[PDB]
Design an enzyme around this catalytic site. Structure first.
Site, short mmCIF file in Angstrom:
data_model
loop_
_atom_site.label_atom_id
_atom_site.label_comp_id
_atom_site.label_asym_id
_atom_site.label_seq_id
_atom_site.Cartn_x
_atom_site.Cartn_y
_atom_site.Cartn_z
N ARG A 9 16.02 -9.39 -10.01
CA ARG A 9 16.59 -9.64 -8.66
C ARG A 9 15.86 -8.67 -7.72
NH1 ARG A 9 18.20 -14.09 -6.97
NH2 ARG A 9 19.64 -14.31 -8.74
N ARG A 10 15.11 -9.18 -6.74
CA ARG A 10 14.26 -8.35 -5.90
C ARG A 10 15.06 -7.29 -5.16
NH1 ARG A 10 8.87 -8.47 -3.38
NH2 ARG A 10 8.39 -9.86 -5.13
N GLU A 39 -0.51 -15.07 -8.46
CA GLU A 39 -1.61 -15.15 -7.52
C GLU A 39 -1.50 -16.42 -6.68
OE1 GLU A 39 -5.18 -14.37 -9.75
OE2 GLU A 39 -4.66 -12.26 -9.88
N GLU A 82 14.09 -19.29 -13.59
CA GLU A 82 13.38 -18.58 -14.65
C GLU A 82 14.22 -18.49 -15.92
OE1 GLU A 82 12.30 -14.86 -12.66
OE2 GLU A 82 10.78 -15.93 -11.50
O1 LIG Z 1 10.90 -11.36 -7.41
C1 LIG Z 1 12.26 -11.68 -7.69
C2 LIG Z 1 12.44 -12.55 -8.91
O2 LIG Z 1 12.25 -13.95 -8.59
C3 LIG Z 1 10.85 -14.19 -8.55
O3 LIG Z 1 10.32 -13.95 -7.27
C4 LIG Z 1 10.23 -13.18 -9.52
O4 LIG Z 1 9.57 -13.88 -10.56
C5 LIG Z 1 11.42 -12.32 -9.99
O5 LIG Z 1 11.99 -12.74 -11.22
CL LIG Z 2 15.17 -12.63 -6.19
#
Ligand SMILES: OC[C@H]1O[C@@H](O)[C@H](O)[C@@H]1O
Ligand SMILES: [Cl-]
Length: 140
Positions: A9-10, A39, A82
């Site tokens: 989670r960013r 990329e 993911e």
């Molecule tokens: O960056 C925050 C999350 O979500 C995606 O941007 C990345 O793969 C990471 O798991």
């Molecule tokens: Cl995120």
């Protein structure tokens, strides 16, 4: 292809995700984390393909990390996507718990409730080397 994909989670797990990346690289694992290996191109497709390529799926569960997944039944949230990819592909999923409260399964979309059935690793600030050694034991 990476051995390890780090999902995080960013807004709350960025620092731990980066620390995991450094340690796992030092122990010889190829690691995918977005800020180093994502990329050019359509990022949705590239992120899913990168989950598919890695044997191990390391999930950083910082406080509230699955909140944006709740009621995300159209699967628009990237972490949700993911996790579903790692589950559907039968990846070796290794949750890392850092102040995370386990939600009741029914608050999560059906397609990711299974993530709660995997054995997790508690991140210990006071015993970080031992935490890393346990993560390495969990990796394939
Ligand atoms: O960056 C925050 C999350 O979500 C995606 O941007 C990345 O793969 C990471 O798991
Ligand atoms: Cl995120």
């Amino acid at each position: 292809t990476p051995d390890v994909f780090i999902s995080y989670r960013r807004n709350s797990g960025s620092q731990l995700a980066s620390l995991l990346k450094v340690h796992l690289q030092l122990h010889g694992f190829s690691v995918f984390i977005d800020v180093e290996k994502l990329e050019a191109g359509k990022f949705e497709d590239k992120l899913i393909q990168s989950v598919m390529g890695a044997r191990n799926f390391v999930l950083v569960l910082s406080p509230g990390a699955l909140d944006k997944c709740m009621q995300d039944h159209d699967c628009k949230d990237w972490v949700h996507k993911e996790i579903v990819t790692a589950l559907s592909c039968g990846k070796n999923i290794v949750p890392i718990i850092d102040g995370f409260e386990w939600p009741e399964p029914q608050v999560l979309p059906e397609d990711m409730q299974a993530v709660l059935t995997f054995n997790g690793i508690k991140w210990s600030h006071e015993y970080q080397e031992a935490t890393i050694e346990k993560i390495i034991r969990f990796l394939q």
